[PDB]
Structure formats: structure tokens, C-alpha cells
Curated annotation (Swiss-Prot):
Cu cation 2 binds at residues 74, 112, 424. Multicopper oxidase involved in copper homeostasis and copper tolerance under aerobic conditions. Is responsible for the oxidation of Cu(+) to the less harmful Cu(2+) in the periplasm, thereby preventing Cu(+) from entering the cytoplasm. Probably primarily functions as a cuprous oxidase in vivo. This is Multicopper oxidase CueO. Disruption phenotype: Disruption mutant is slightly more copper sensitive on complex medium than wild-type strain under aerobic conditions. Deletion of the gene does not affect copper sensitivity under anaerobic growth conditions. Deletion of the gene leads to elevated biosynthesis of enterobactin under conditions of iron scarcity when copper is present. Contains a methionine-rich region, which includes a helix that covers the entrance to the type 1 (T1) copper site and blocks access to the T1 site in the absence of excess copper. This methionine-rich insert is involved in the binding and oxidation of Cu(+). It also binds additional copper ions, which are important for the copper-associated regulation of activity. The methionine-rich region provides at least three additional Cu(+) binding sites: Cu5 (sCu), Cu6 and Cu7, which play related but distinct roles in CueO oxidase activities. The lineage of its organism: Bacteria, Pseudomonadati, Pseudomonadota, Gammaproteobacteria, Enterobacterales. Exported by the Tat system. The position of the signal peptide cleavage has been experimentally proven.
Length: 444
């Protein structure tokens, strides 16, 4: 029998308003073969940290790895000080406590290491967790909300394992250029698991947690997916799609119908991306089996989900140009491999800016991620974004063309705890396709 889909623990504050995350190495089993793996509160992956908008919490982070790491909250609008980029080193055995004061809409964000030059490796070893942000608005909506029953996180990741069963990761020249990818697909750490889903609506919180592999979700019998949310939260209304491309580090929440008899698979369809159509990803590849069950179901598909603000006039907005490049081993932005002691520029706090990110000059896929914000895509690789990508995003496709995003940073980031903007193809990031920027002013 297929293993059941592991469900990350939905982790809330304790009585002292704290959350403990312990980073550790342990063992996992894949295809009957044990492997050393890393996890948060466990041997692999991590919990779903549940936060409420407007309610500050403290997170105590205990690094019990023998090596240093950082803990970055991907998609969270937080000050640079708690952003957990490459300057937020947690030494081995170290502890760091951060205050998260969430001030953004309900969304599924995530967290992962951001160690300079080792982000790819540390994610590959198993470290990743989720952040479930709720607010008053979403809780009014009657969406499926039984965690691990009809509201299910789906963290999809490939890994490359050596013949000894261990995770095989080396940042060699090939891996640096094309990315780290493998022939084994995991769904919350499990190979082709099954999920028992109540008849009615099933909500999947999809995260592409791969280092380098882009995905394209569909169902085996071509029943539609109704996209209800993107990286930064709810769409205004559901967007019905037959397939759903998801770039590295992107989240989408979809609703899918479950009718009593027919089990079906969520699958990923072959993508046009260097390395990624190699077997077994040359064909539609199962991600997980949905098995209908006859237990109580908590939700439906609302006709309207939220509001999206109108895009503002662009006149007078600061424009920033970011040129991605790959000059062999050296991956760069504006002709510079990432320099931790030199932020490329100082962004304004609380002001819309237009950032123009170009991948002209190479044909590789660069999902470009900007810390400290949820932005609106104005142009995605030469076209206005698709309906389901037109809301709140922290990632924009850059692939041989030019993208334009409308960003606003609500929180300070000084030069000592700067925000990152980078390609989220982790091997590019680690080999220099990243820049630091500050937001606001600062005086100590
Ligand atoms: Cu991030
Ligand atoms: Cu890239």
C-alpha cells in the first residue's frame, strides 16, 4: 500500500506566547533505504507554524546541527533583523529568539535555511517548514479547514540519492549551472503517498520546495484545480485551471473536488527546463493519490474570496534595474556575485518601487524572489501575469526576458541585517545570483 501522506504538525504558541523550533539531524527511510536527513522538530522537513495577523509571537530557534545555519521566513513581511538571511548566522548548538509580528493577509508562507553558499545543501538535507497565516477575513470564508483532512499541505520536492541511500549533494560545475535535481519525488517527505480525503472539497496548500525543479500540477483524470491563493494570500476570486505551473519556492492553494468512488492522482507534468524533463520526469509523474473517504467535510468553494487593490499609477515611482547573468561559474546580478558586506542599494520604506529584473542573455529559469515583501507582478517575463498570478506574489518568473514587479517594503532592514533579492534556483543563489539591499534609514 502507498504510505499515507505525512502531515506536518500545525504548531501554535504555548502559554508563554512562544514557539520552539529545534534544528536537528536524524534518519529517514526512502524506498526501504535509510538516509541521514535534517528537520525542524523532527528528522525531516518541519512543522506548519500557525500565526495570526496582528498577534506577535516569539520563536525560539535551537540549532542542534554540528554546522551553522539561518532560519528565513520566506514570504513574511518582517524587519531585516528577523529576516534570517545569510547574516542571521545561528552557530552550531546556538539559540536565537525572534519576534514575529505578522502584519499581512492570510497566506501559506514557508521557512528554510539561508546560509550563504550552503542554502541549496541545507534545503536538500531536509530543512523546510511552513507558515500558516490566518486573519479574520479568511476565517469567515467557509473554506475546507480541517488540517490534515481536507486542508492539506503538499510540499513537493525531488531529491538525488546515492546508491548507499544517502542524499547526494555537491555544488559542482553542473549543479551550479542547472541546479540540484533528482529522480525521486517526495510529497511531505514520502514517496507517492496516498491521502484519504473527505467527499466534497479538498484544499491543497502546494509548495514547490525543490532546489531547482519547476513543477506543473494537474490531476490524472483532468478534473480542474481551483486556485484560491498565491504566495502572499487569497486571490479576489477562484481561478479555475487545468494545469498549474509552480516555480521553486512558490505556493498556491487550490481546491479540488472529491467524488465518492474514483481515486485520482495529483500529478506533475513534464516541464521545459534544463535537466528537468529527464526520466522519470519525462512523463506525467504522480505526486500523491487522493483516496475519497466518507467522513465529515468542512468547506466549499466561495464565489468571492477577497479584494485585491487596484494597481497604482506608476508615474514618479523609483525604478530599479536588476540584470541577472551567468558568466560561467560566476552567477551574478548587475555584474556582481553576491557580496555580503556591500548592499547594492538602499530602498525606500513604505514606498512603491518598480523593480525590473532581466534574464535577457541566458535561457535558464530564474524564479526571482525578493525578501521582505509581497509584491504585484506588472509583467512576468514579457506578459502580464496569468489571473492566478496577478495577486500577491514573492516570486516572479525570469527566463530569457524581463519582468517587472511593483514592490513595497513596510519594514526596515539595515546594512547589518539586509534583505535579499535572489534567484530561488538555490544553486544560482549559492554561487552568486543574489544581492542585499537595505530598506529605510538607521542610526545606532
Ligand atoms: Cu524569502
Ligand atoms: Cu537562476
Amino acid at each position: 500500500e502507498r504510505p499515507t501522506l505525512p502531515i506536518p504538525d500545525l504548531l501554535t504558541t504555548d502559554a508563554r506566547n512562544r514557539i520552539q523550533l529545534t534544528i536537528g539531524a536524524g534518519q529517514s527511510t526512502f524506498g526501504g533505504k535509510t538516509a541521514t536527513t535534517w528537520g525542524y522538530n523532527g528528522n525531516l522537513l518541519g512543522p506548519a507554524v500557525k500565526l495570526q495577523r496582528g498577534k506577535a509571537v516569539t520563536v525560539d530557534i535551537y540549532n542542534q546541527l554540528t554546522e551553522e545555519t539561518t532560519l528565513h521566513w520566506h514570504g513574511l513581511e518582517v524587519p531585516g533583523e528577523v529576516d534570517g538571511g545569510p547574516q542571521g548566522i545561528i552557530p552550531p548548538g546556538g539559540k536565537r529568539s525572534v519576534t514575529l509580528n505578522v502584519d499581512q493577509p492570510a497566506a501559506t508562507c514557508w521557512f528554510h535555511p539561508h546560509q550563504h553558499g550552503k542554502t541549496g545543501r541545507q534545503v536538500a538535507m531536509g530543512l523546510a517548514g511552513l507558515v500558516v497565516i490566518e486573519d479574520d477575513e479568511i476565517l469567515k470564508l467557509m473554506l475546507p479547514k480541517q488540517w490534515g483532512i481536507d486542508d492539506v499541505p503538499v510540499i513537493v520536492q525531488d531529491k538525488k540519492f546515492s546508491a548507499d541511500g544517502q542524499i547526494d549533494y555537491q555544488l559542482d560545475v553542473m549543479t551550479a549551472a542547472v541546479g540540484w535535481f533528482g529522480d525521486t519525488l517526495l510529497t511531505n517527505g514520502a514517496i507517492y503517498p496516498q491521502h484519504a480525503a473527505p467527499r466534497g472539497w479538498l484544499r491543497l496548500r502546494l509548495l514547490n520546495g525543490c532546489n531547482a525543479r519547476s513543477l506543473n500540477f494537474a490531476t490524472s483524470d483532468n478534473r480542474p484545480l481551483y486556485v484560491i491563493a498565491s504566495d502572499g494570500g487569497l486571490l479576489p476570486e477562484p481561478v479555475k485551471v487545468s494545469e498549474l505551473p509552480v516555480l521553486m519556492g512558490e505556493r498556491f492553494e487550490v481546491l479540488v473536488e472529491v467524488n465518492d468512488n474514483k481515486p485520482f492522482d495529483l500529478v506533475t507534468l513534464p516541464v521545459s527546463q534544463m535537466g528537468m524533463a529527464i526520466a522519470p520526469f519525462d512523463k506525467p509523474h504522480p505526486v500523491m493519490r487522493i483516496q475519497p473517504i466518507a467522513i465529515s467535510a468542512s468547506g466549499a468553494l466561495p464565489d468571492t474570496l477577497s479584494s485585491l487593490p487596484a494597481l497604482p499609477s506608476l508615474e514618479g515611482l523609483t525604478v530599479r534595474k536588476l540584470q541577472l547573468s551567468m558568466d560561467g561559474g560566476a552567477n551574478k546580478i548587475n555584474g556582481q556575485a553576491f557580496d555580503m558586506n556591500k548592499p547594492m542599494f538602499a530602498a525606500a520604506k513604505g514606498q512603491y518601487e518598480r523593480w525590473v529584473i532581466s534574464g535577457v542573455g541566458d535561457m535558464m529559469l530564474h524564479p526571482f524572489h525578493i525578501h521582505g515583501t509581497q509584491f504585484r507582478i506588472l509583467s512576468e517575463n514579457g506578459k502580464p501575469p496569468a489571473a492566478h498570478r496577478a495577486g500577491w506574489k514573492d516570486t516572479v518568473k525570469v527566463e530569457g526576458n524581463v519582468s517587472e514587479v511593483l514592490v513595497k517594503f513596510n519594514h526596515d532592514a539595515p546594512k547589518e541585517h539586509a534583505y535579499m533579492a535572489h534567484c530561488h534556483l538555490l544553486e544560482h543563489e549559492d554561487t552568486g545570483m543574489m544581492l542585499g539591499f537595505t530598506v529605510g534609514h538607521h542610526h545606532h
